[PDB]
Structure formats: structure tokens, C-alpha cells
Amino acid sequence: MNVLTTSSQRGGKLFKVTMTLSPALSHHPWPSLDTYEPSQNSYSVVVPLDRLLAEMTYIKNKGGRVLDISPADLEALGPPDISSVAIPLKVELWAKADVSDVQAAIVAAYKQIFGNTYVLESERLTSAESLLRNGSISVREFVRLLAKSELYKERFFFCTSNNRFTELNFKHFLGRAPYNQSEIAAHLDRYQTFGYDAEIDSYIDSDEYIQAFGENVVPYYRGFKSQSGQTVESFNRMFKLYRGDAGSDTNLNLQGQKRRVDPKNLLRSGRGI
Amino acid sequence: YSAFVRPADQATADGAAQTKLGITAIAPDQGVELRPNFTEADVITV
Numbered sequence: 001m002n003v004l005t006t007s008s009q010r011g012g013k014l015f016k017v018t019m020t021l022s023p024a025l026s027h028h029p030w031p032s033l034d035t036y037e038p039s040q041n042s043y044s045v046v047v048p049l050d051r052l053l054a055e056m057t058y059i060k061n062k063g064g065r066v067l068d069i070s071p072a073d074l075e076a077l078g079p080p081d082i083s084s085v086a087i088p089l090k091v092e093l094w095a096k097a098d099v100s101d102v103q104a105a106i107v108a109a110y111k112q113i114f115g116n117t118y119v120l121e122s123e124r125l126t127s128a129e130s131l132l133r134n135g136s137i138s139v140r141e142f143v144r145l146l147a148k149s150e151l152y153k154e155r156f157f158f159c160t161s162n163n164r165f166t167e168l169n170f171k172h173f174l175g176r177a178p179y180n181q182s183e184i185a186a187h188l189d190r191y192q193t194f195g196y197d198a199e200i201d202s203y204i205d206s207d208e209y210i211q212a213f214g215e216n217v218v219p220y221y222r223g224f225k226s227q228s229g230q231t232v233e234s235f236n237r238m239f240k241l242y243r244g245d246a247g248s249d250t251n252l253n254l255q256g257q258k259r260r261v262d263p264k265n266l267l268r269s270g271r272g273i
Numbered sequence: 274y275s276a277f278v279r280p281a282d283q284a285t286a287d288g289a290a291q292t293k294l295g296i297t298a299i300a301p302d303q304g305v306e307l308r309p310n311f312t313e314a315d316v317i318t319v
């Protein structure tokens with residue numbers, strides 16, 4: 001929830017704390033059994049650095065456990081600007097492209113394919129790059145190569161959960177964020193029997209990928225603008241998958257690969273399976 | 274089956290004891306709890 005003031009009257013760094021409430025923590029003033037209100041199943045308290053210790057001990061002494069603590073300054077920050085992604089840009093590799101035009105596509109691809117994530121010179125793939133610019137490989141085929149490349153697996157698929165990897169994949173291959181639980185399910189099943197390669201293939205193969213930036217167009221963020229057969233909640237999910245510019249999908253950070261989209265949110269949009 | 278009941282002596286009743294102390298309903302307390310959805314009035318009363 002929005003936190004109104006970053007620092008307290010006496011200087012301190014306010015911190016939001018979220019806890020699963022317990023009947024002892026809060027209880028109605030009613031006869032019968034003590035019950036914490038339902039709406040506050042998750043309860044957010046804002047406390048100065050000083051009281052934090054004592055506030056949390058008490059929460060944990062009771063049946064409460066701490067869902068997460070975030071600094072109030074990071075919290076109560078705007079939703080990320082959608083400036084750049086509102087209209088993506090678009091990169092088209094013409095046949096008989098000039099040396100510079102090929103370079104632009106490569107740089108654009110690496111951006112969207114691997115997220116903000118930086119690719120070192122050593123990491124970068126000469127062979128694949130070589131083929132584009134002589135002809136022989138579509139931009140689409142270059143895309144395939146990159147997903148198949150270990151670089152991608154090490155980052156996205158090998159560190160995080162396959163539940164993580166699917167949306168991570170959706171975003172990279174399609175602007176879109178995942179809509180519905182079903183898509184996540186389907187992909188996992190495909191992975192079990194077919195293996196990595198077939199799952200990777202399915203996204204590029206899929207008609208949605210063909211309908212927008214089908215061939216020789218580097219993928220751009222379709223999400224953050226209205227799309228056919230896209231649940232409204234997906235739009236909100238995009239904001240969770242995409243944090244800012246200069247914000248990347250990083251295996252490097254502490255507990256690096258986690259879920260941007262909470263599973264319940266997916267279930268909201270669609271259930272059936 | 275006499276069902277002798279009778280007024281009895283002391284005849285203190287429920288009310289008299291507290292009126293003697295003079296609590297006049299300070300000792301009995303009805304708690305007031307806020308709700309996430311509340312009328313401004315309900316906030317006022319709080």
C-alpha cells in the first residue's frame with residue numbers, strides 16, 4: 001500500500017512491514033472467539049527504524065510471520081514510466097542491409113531477447129551474427145539461436161523455476177506478459193516430454209509471434225498497449241514483469257530469480273484446467 | 274411446590290451497587306473498533 005511519508009518526525013527511515021495477521025495480534029471486540037478482520041489477512045505496518053526490532057519480535061512471538069519488509073523510500077515510488085515501451089520503436093532488417101543496419105538489429109535483439117541484462121563481448125555470439133548480414137538467416141531465425149544459446153539458459157531457465165521461466169520467456173519473445181494459468185501449465189507440460197528446445201521453438205513458431213514482427217523484425221513490447229485476446233489483468237502484470245528502464249531480469253541479484261507475477265493473479269484472469 | 278419467592282431484605286438489585294461507587298456506567302465499557310471501510314462519521318466517533 002502507498003506510504004505517505006518517507007521519514008518520521010524525529011529523523012528515521014520509515015519501513016513498511018507486511019505480516020500475516022493472527023487473532024491475537026488484532027481481535028474484534030465481540031463475544032465468542034477472537035477473529036482478525038478478513039480484509040487484513042495481510043497487514044501492512046509502517047514503523048521507524050528504532051521500533052522495527054520490537055515491532056517484529058512481537059509479531060513473530062504471536063502466530064504472525066513476516067511476509068516482507070521494504071524500505072519506504074523504494075515503496076511509495078511511482079509505477080515505472082512506460083514512456084519507451086508505450087510505443088516500442090521497431091527494427092526491420094531489410095534484405096541487402098548496410099553494415100550499420102545489421103549492427104542496429106543485433107543490438108536491439110540482444111536488448112529485448114536478454115532483457116536489460118548486459119551481454120559481455122565474450123558472451124556475444126559471433127557465428128550467429130556472421131550469418132545475418134550474408135543473408136541465410138532470418139531475424140526470426142537469429143532470435144531462435146539466441147534462445148537456444150546457453151547464455152539465455154544460464155540466465156533465465158537454469159537459475160529460476162520453470163514457472164518463472166515461462167513468463168520470462170513470454171516477455172522476451174513477445175512483448176506480452178502471460179495471460180491465464182493455462183499458458184503457464186501448457187508450457188511446463190511441453191518442457192517435460194519435448195524438452196527445452198521444443199518449448200523455445202513454440203513461442204517463435206506461434207502465430208502471435210508471426211502476426212506481429214513475424215519475420216525480419218526484432219521483437220518489441222506489445223504489452224503496455226491493448227492487444228487482441230489479452231485479459232485486462234495482463235496489462236497490470238506487465239507492470240510487474242517490467243520494472244523501469246535499467247531494470248533487468250537478473251540471476252545475479254540476491255535470490256535473483258523469483259516470480260514477478262504472483263500465481264493468484266494469473267488465476268484471477270482465468271481458471272479451468 | 275411452595276414457590277415462596279419473596280422481596281428479601283437487602284434489596285440491593287443490579288443497579289444500586291454501581292450507583293453507590295458512582296461508576297454510572299464508566300466500569301462497563303463498550304469497545305469501539307475501526308474498519309478498513311468506514312463512514313467518516315465512524316472515524317469521527319473514534
Ligand SMILES: *[C@H](C)[C@H]1/C(=C/c2[nH]c(/C=C3N=C(/C=C4\NC(=O)C(CC)=C4C)C(C)=C\3CCC(=O)O)c(CCC(=O)O)c2C)NC(=O)[C@@H]1C
Pocket residue numbers: 023033034035036037038
Ligand atoms: C466452516 C463452514 C468452514 C471453515 C471455516 C473456518 N474458518 C477458520 C478460520 C477463520 N475464518 C475466518 C473468517 C472470519 N473472521 C471474521 O472476522 C469474519 C467476518 C467478519 C470471518 C467470516 C477467520 C478470520 C479465521 C481465522 C482466525 C479466526 O478464527 O478468527 C477456520 C479455522 C482456521 C484456524 O486455524 O483457526 C475454519 C475451520 N473451515 C472448515 O472446516 C469449513 C469448510
